[PDB]
Nucleic acid binder design. Structure first.
Length: 74
DNA sequence: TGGAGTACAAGTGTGAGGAAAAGTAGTTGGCGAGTAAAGCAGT
């Protein structure tokens, strides 16, 4: 319900839904072949809030823009 | 021959810890000179 929805999205989600598309396609890429392509600054997991939108940034509140960049690693 | 359970191995009930950017403080600092006349005191 839109009344107090509290949607559960994190940067751990956008890798997890990117891992499941790899096993339905039956790919040899894994979470060792994801954490080696994100912590080596290859696909934009880290620092995503700050450089990606460039026009949609400013009206987003402070705790929401905190979650969308690559804050920690999982 | 057949049970007391006591063990590890399965479960589900009970609130909180850590994350962080903008926004918000107490605090300095850095401003806007004459020639004349009449008056009523004066004595």
């Amino acid at each position: 319900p839109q009344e107090e929805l509290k949607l559960q999205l994190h940067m751990t989600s956008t890798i997890s839904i990117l891992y499941l598309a790899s096993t339905h396609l039956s790919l040899p890429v894994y979470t060792c072949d994801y954490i080696k392509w994100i912590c080596t600054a290859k696909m934009p997991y880290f620092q995503a809030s700050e450089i990606l939108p460039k026009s949609w940034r400013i009206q987003l509140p402070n705790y929401y823009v905190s979650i969308l960049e690559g804050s920690i690693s999982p």
